[PDB]
Amino acid sequence: EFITVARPYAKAAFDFAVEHQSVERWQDMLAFAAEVTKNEQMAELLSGALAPETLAESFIAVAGEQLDENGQNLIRVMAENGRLNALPDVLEQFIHLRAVSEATAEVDVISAAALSEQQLAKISAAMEKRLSRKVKLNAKIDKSVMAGVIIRAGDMVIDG
Amino acid sequence: NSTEISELIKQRIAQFNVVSEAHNEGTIVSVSDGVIRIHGLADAMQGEMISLPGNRYAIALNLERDSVGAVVMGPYADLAEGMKVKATGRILEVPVGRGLLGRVVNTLGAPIDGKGPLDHDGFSAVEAIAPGVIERQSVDQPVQTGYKAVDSMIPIGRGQRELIIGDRQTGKTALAIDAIINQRDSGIKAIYVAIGQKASTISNVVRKLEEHGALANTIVVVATASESAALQYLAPYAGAAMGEYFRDRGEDALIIYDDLSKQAVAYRQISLLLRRPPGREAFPGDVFYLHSRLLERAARVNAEYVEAFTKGEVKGKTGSLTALPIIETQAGDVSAFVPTNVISITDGQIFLETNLFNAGIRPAVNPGISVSRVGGAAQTKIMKKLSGGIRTALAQYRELAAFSQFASDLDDATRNQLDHGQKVTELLKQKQYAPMSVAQQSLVLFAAERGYLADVELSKIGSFEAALLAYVDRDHAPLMQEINQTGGYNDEIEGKLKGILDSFKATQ
Amino acid sequence: TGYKAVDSMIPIGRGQRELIIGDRQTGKTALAIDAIINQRDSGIKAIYVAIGQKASTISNVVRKLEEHGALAN
Amino acid sequence: HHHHHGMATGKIVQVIGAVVDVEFPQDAVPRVYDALEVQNGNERLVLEVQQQLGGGIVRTIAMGSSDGLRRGLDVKDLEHPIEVPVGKATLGRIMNVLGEPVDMKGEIGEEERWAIHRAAPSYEELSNSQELLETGIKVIDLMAPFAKGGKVGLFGGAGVGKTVNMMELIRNIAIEHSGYSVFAGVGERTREGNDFYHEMTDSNVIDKVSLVYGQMNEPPGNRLRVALTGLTMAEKFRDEGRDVLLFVDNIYRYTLAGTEVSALLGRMPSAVGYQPTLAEEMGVLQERITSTKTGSITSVQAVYVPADDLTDPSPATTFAHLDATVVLSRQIASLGIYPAVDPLDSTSRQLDPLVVGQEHYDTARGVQSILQRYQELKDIIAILGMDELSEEDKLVVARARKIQRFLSQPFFVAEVFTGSPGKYVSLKDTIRGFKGIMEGEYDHLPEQAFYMVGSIEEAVEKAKKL
Amino acid sequence: GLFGGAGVGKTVNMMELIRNIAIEHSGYSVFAGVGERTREGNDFYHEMTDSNVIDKVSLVYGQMNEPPGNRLRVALTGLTMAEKFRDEGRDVLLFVDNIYRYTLAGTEVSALLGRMPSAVGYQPTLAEEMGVLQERITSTKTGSITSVQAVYVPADD
Numbered sequence A: 001e002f003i004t005v006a007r008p009y010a011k012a013a014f015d016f017a018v019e020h021q022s023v024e025r026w027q028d029m030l031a032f033a034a035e036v037t038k039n040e041q042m043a044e045l046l047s048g049a050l051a052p053e054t055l056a057e058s059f060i061a062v063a064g065e066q067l068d069e070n071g072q073n074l075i076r077v078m079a080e081n082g083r084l085n086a087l088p089d090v091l092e093q094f095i096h097l098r099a100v101s102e103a104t105a106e107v108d109v110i111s112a113a114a115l116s117e118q119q120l121a122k123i124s125a126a127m128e129k130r131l132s133r134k135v136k137l138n139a140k141i142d143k144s145v146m147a148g149v150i151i152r153a154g155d156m157v158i159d160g
Numbered sequence B: 001n002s003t004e005i006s007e008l009i010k011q012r013i014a015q016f017n018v019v020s021e022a023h024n025e026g027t028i029v030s031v032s033d034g035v036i037r038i039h040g041l042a043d044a045m046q047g048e049m050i051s052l053p054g055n056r057y058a059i060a061l062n063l064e065r066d067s068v069g070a071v072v073m074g075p076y077a078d079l080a081e082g083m084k085v086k087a088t089g090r091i092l093e094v095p096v097g098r099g100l101l102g103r104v105v106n107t108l109g110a111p112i113d114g115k116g117p118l119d120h121d122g123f124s125a126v127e128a129i130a131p132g133v134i135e136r137q138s139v140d141q142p143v144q145t146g147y148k149a150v151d152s153m154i155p156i157g158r159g160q161r162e163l164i165i166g167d168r169q170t171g172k173t174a175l176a177i178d179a180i181i182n183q184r185d186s187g188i189k190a191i192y193v194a195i196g197q198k199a200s201t202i203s204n205v206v207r208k209l210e211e212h213g214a215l216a217n218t219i220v221v222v223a224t225a226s227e228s229a230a231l232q233y234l235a236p237y238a239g240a241a242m243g244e245y246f247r248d249r250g251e252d253a254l255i256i257y258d259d260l261s262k263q264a265v266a267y268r269q270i271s272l273l274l275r276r277p278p279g280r281e282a283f284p285g286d287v288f289y290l291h292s293r294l295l296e297r298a299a300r301v302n303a304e305y306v307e308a309f310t311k312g313e314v315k316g317k318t319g320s321l322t323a324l325p326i327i328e329t330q331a332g333d334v335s336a337f338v339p340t341n342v343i344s345i346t347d348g349q350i351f352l353e354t355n356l357f358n359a360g361i362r363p364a365v366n367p368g369i370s371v372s373r374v375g376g377a378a379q380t381k382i383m384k385k386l387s388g389g390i391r392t393a394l395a396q397y398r399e400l401a402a403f404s405q406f407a408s409d410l411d412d413a414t415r416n417q418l419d420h421g422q423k424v425t426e427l428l429k430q431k432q433y434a435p436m437s438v439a440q441q442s443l444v445l446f447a448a449e450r451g452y453l454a455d456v457e458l459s460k461i462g463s464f465e466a467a468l469l470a471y472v473d474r475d476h477a478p479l480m481q482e483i484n485q486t487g488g489y490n491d492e493i494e495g496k497l498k499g500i501l502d503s504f505k506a507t508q
Numbered sequence C: 001t002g003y004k005a006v007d008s009m010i011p012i013g014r015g016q017r018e019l020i021i022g023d024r025q026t027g028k029t030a031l032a033i034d035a036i037i038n039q040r041d042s043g044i045k046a047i048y049v050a051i052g053q054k055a056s057t058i059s060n061v062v063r064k065l066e067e068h069g070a071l072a073n
Numbered sequence D: 001h002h003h004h005h006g007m008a009t010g011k012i013v014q015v016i017g018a019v020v021d022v023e024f025p026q027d028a029v030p031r032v033y034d035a036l037e038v039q040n041g042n043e044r045l046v047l048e049v050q051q052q053l054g055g056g057i058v059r060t061i062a063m064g065s066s067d068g069l070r071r072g073l074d075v076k077d078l079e080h081p082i083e084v085p086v087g088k089a090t091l092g093r094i095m096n097v098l099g100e101p102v103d104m105k106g107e108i109g110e111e112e113r114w115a116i117h118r119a120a121p122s123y124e125e126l127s128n129s130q131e132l133l134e135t136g137i138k139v140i141d142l143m144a145p146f147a148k149g150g151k152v153g154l155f156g157g158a159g160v161g162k163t164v165n166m167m168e169l170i171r172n173i174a175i176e177h178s179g180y181s182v183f184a185g186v187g188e189r190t191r192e193g194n195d196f197y198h199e200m201t202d203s204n205v206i207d208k209v210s211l212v213y214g215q216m217n218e219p220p221g222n223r224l225r226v227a228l229t230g231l232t233m234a235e236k237f238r239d240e241g242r243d244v245l246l247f248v249d250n251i252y253r254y255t256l257a258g259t260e261v262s263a264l265l266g267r268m269p270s271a272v273g274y275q276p277t278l279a280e281e282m283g284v285l286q287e288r289i290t291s292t293k294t295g296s297i298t299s300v301q302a303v304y305v306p307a308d309d310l311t312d313p314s315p316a317t318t319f320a321h322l323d324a325t326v327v328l329s330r331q332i333a334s335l336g337i338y339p340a341v342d343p344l345d346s347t348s349r350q351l352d353p354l355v356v357g358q359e360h361y362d363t364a365r366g367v368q369s370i371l372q373r374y375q376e377l378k379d380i381i382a383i384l385g386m387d388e389l390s391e392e393d394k395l396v397v398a399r400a401r402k403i404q405r406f407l408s409q410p411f412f413v414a415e416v417f418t419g420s421p422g423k424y425v426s427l428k429d430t431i432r433g434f435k436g437i438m439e440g441e442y443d444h445l446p447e448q449a450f451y452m453v454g455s456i457e458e459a460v461e462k463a464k465k466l
Numbered sequence E: 001g002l003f004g005g006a007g008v009g010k011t012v013n014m015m016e017l018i019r020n021i022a023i024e025h026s027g028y029s030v031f032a033g034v035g036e037r038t039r040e041g042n043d044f045y046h047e048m049t050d051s052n053v054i055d056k057v058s059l060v061y062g063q064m065n066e067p068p069g070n071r072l073r074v075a076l077t078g079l080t081m082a083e084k085f086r087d088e089g090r091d092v093l094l095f096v097d098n099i100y101r102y103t104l105a106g107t108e109v110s111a112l113l114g115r116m117p118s119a120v121g122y123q124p125t126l127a128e129e130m131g132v133l134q135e136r137i138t139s140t141k142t143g144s145i146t147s148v149q150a151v152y153v154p155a156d157d
């Protein structure tokens, strides 16, 4: 999980993704790929072999041909990199990558996370807060805020 | 890791598909202090010089997969990374001409004097293979000591491995240096290495080149503090190119070399740069690989030299090449792997003793502290002849020391020995700067031949009596020419000596 | 014993770590290994430490057990 | 000075201590030292250059305090990679390492500016001269000649009096001026510093020179920088004056910081954990020293000898680069001798007998012989005691303890340490000493008398009483 | 090995050896030399001149210049023919040049390897090399494997 290593790879991604404008498409490619990577019986086999060509070919081969030429030459980069083993991490990055542009999500307050796409901190946020009306759900909230205020409280008891 | 481009990844993103473009000149990704990771100039020649922004060319030894980088002597800071490379087609070569004897130059042969004149022919790479076996002729050619014990202590044929070994601050840059003078009017051609030296040394040196006004019979290059090690790393190899133009010119030469180690660990700093594991003290495993290269160079060719460059406009004759090692020791530690590998390497050995230096004795060296396998082949039937007692006196005086401790244990037989040894001891003397007559060598024989010891018995009067002696020469000095000329031992000639002993009676 | 002055000089019984340290060339490789002969009766079997030294050692050694006799023990 | 407008930024990439890990535009590019600004919450700060790292991210350096910084921070830049105002007005008030007037006086100083980089004369460019200087130094002025422009070396770690022996350096230096010169000190103690300031005031000599003085506890980045302060500092003068003189401090610290940062650079140390280029750095610094045909300069220099390991490669580059130098004996010190220098050790390349005539060269040689001897038998005694002393030897030994004991004399300014004053000395009088001692001329002479003593006349007055 | 020193004129000894090889026996014997001072070869040439040892003259090349690996490597070369004549069962002798110059060799080997410097970068094969030599030489049922000493020594004690 170097994953920081992602960037030069990961970075050119968005750019190619930007340039190639695939991100719908490229996004597809990534979905497909992480899928491919996931394959465990394959995985045992996956570090098996020395010849990079062999893997580009075989991997690309059973793949179901979701591949792109830019992603062929480039996949050839990751294998030539030999680093390719860990690739799926980038999708996470890619997510943020995709996310980066214009996105937003949410952290559950005490219940469940809206992940609302709201780009104004504490504003678009506030918009969601007010937007409750989702005010209904408990979902452990009370134990949480009462226990957390209670936590600041006993914290002061200690302070007392 | 090395990949690192990411932006060219964008390039390579699809360009992994298509490349097939070999520049002579690739961009130099990033640099440290003259050395740069770089990519391009797809074709490789190992150790190829590589032109740069500005005249400079550089080189890298390490074949480095998928990218490589290199450094160059020069301003390293001006440059900017990723510049299109400047390919240099030639591996480095150095100008080769026989006309520099009066002028010295930067590592480039750039005259630091700025003589402005250029007498040299073409240019030629610094390092090259040595001559075949048996292509060498053994050479009896003597040499002029000027320290009596230099020749008397040791003979010198042309071509031998020198030693100088001795402590820092011992005098041994001018104990080392002071040596160079005796050469003088010799007429053989020579150069002196300089490792990193302080300039004032250079200047005053030049003044000495007024002292010996000569200064032009032979030239020497220089190394200074600003200098790039690469300059040094080749600098011995650099001079190698030239003296090869004398031996290769059929000429016979000696070239001083000293203070290498400075260069050496500098080459370690290369290894740090090389990010490559060194040996102890960060010493390159190379070591005797380098020393192999440079040290390997010196020779006295045989009429195999009849095969010449012109091979031959004959001149079917044998060339010979000598040179000067100087070593230095902190605390006088023999463990020095440098002195180890080197010590092993040396053909003959020279040690200076900070005792006699500490004695302030004119010489600091110790009998048997310094030895040479070459031996007395160079020593002349007279010179060879008369020279024996040294060792014993050495021993003796040395051995004499033994009872000195037990005070007053000994009788006159001893006292005659010991006295004689004090006497010889005295007999050793030398100026800080003096030329040597070597007819003066004949002088010594008296103490052997002439009783001469009882005479001028007085310490002061012995000493002075040396001078007075020297003077008396003017009274008669016809045969010395012949003597100086003859260079041979004639029993009949010994008469002239016997009678000279009268002039001793004559001169006080 | 195998060595008078050592026997007298030191006693020996079974199971006890014994140490030895000594100069090569004498007698070292030889040592007292002849004290195997001291076994004679050989009530306790034993095995010689074998080290990679010499086929010759192996050889004169073989010859030596022979000279003594017998190695089948 | 001039804006220096905009320029956007590197963002702070990674927090490695004081090491600057941050990333700027692709086009954004420095020199191996170049001008970058950034405001801390408090203030503009600057990190000197990086060597070369990619991604608009390179490393960098600082004289400031690293803590309390937020990552990703934007960073400004100045055009002039280095700009050092060069005035002659400076002699009034000291300045920061920034050159910020260290005195309370604000100083307009001068517009002319300088930068760290500086370069050496041509082969022919400098002048070489034998003019020399002689003073109240009991020996060393006597024991050794001092040519004009000469850079005197100081040997040793401190505690040697290296500040107090250094204080002697002040004295003799202080003793004779007949010109304009300036020295400073850095990574150094204040009690001294403020004292030299108050006494400088009292002296009121500051007109002749001012010197920024660096502090011991100072941050390294400055410490590193201080040399450039030296070189540029000279540059004006060398241009300005043909002649100069100075003194140098804590160059041990120089090495010290330098090594200290080396691996911080992600470099492997030179041996004994030295820094790999450290010698290169040295040939740099000593190389910075020069005296030219157009102008020459003198200064004397000190680096703490680490621990009296002479093998110290630091000490190697010392003698190597050494110009002039001196040595001190912690036995001789330990001998309680006030002067406490390693006489047997120290040596003058310039010393020439021809220059010195024979009498100097000779006599000195002789004493040297004695030293050789007393050293020589010193063993035999220690073993045997003296019971067996050969008459002659025994005599010499007398001359020996006497001669050692003899070297010592009082110093006028010295009354501080020991209430006792002293005086300047006259060479000829010394020459006399050479003979009479050589004579052992005064046979009854008191041993105790000779120590820390006045002339043979004075010691003769002692001799009267003492 | 022969404890020996310069100035001894040990060559005289060597000659006596060969003369006893053809005289005392059929030597069918050759000398080995490597890494050495240039001089003797001429002398040897001279000696090979002086001697009829030109009959029978193999010249083992003797230079140090080679790669420390190249240099060190020469053994099996030295071996294979004596392997012929001793394997011919014929009495065969060969001269050996350097002993602990070869020590320096095997070290320079292991170091060159980038194989981890052993204790003081000790050479790995010292036992495998040394006893490889041992493995070479014996009175062999076919023919004895007879060879001359090498003296080179690290400090020569």
Ligand SMILES: Nc1ncnc2c1ncn2[C@@H]1O[C@H](COP(=O)(O)OP(=O)(O)OP(=O)(O)O)[C@@H](O)[C@H]1O
Binding pocket: B167, B168, B169, B170, B171, B172, B173, B174, B175, B176, B177, B178, B360, B361, B362, B363, B430, B431, B432, B433, D349
């Ligand atoms: N005959 C002599 N007797 C004593 N000293 C001499 C003699 N000839 C030359 N010297 C001295 O050697 C002295 C110092 O030599 P030098 O300056 O080379 O020291 P150094 O060699 O630089 O130190 P190192 O010994 O470490 O190289 C010179 O002052 C010179 O006078």
Ligand SMILES: Nc1ncnc2c1ncn2[C@@H]1O[C@H](COP(=O)(O)OP(=O)(O)OP(=O)(O)O)[C@@H](O)[C@H]1O
Binding pocket: C023, C024, C025, C026, C027, C028, C029, C030, C031
């Ligand atoms: N001091 C001694 N007294 C009696 N015999 C001795 C003595 N020294 C050596 N020997 C003889 O030498 C033999 C021991 O030699 P051996 O070579 O085994 O010694 P070593 O140290 O083992 O040699 P290495 O260990 O080098 O093989 C014994 O058989 C004995 O005959």
Ligand SMILES: Nc1ncnc2c1ncn2[C@@H]1O[C@H](COP(=O)(O)OP(=O)(O)O)[C@@H](O)[C@H]1O
Binding pocket: D157, D158, D159, D160, D161, D162, D163, D164, D165, D166, D167, D337, D338, D339, D340, D417
């Ligand atoms: N000639 C001298 N006589 C007596 N003491 C001296 C002399 N020179 C230096 N010192 C002593 O050196 C001591 C240490 O002061 P300082 O110079 O800081 O030593 P250092 O600088 O070597 O640490 C001072 O207390 C001072 O008394």
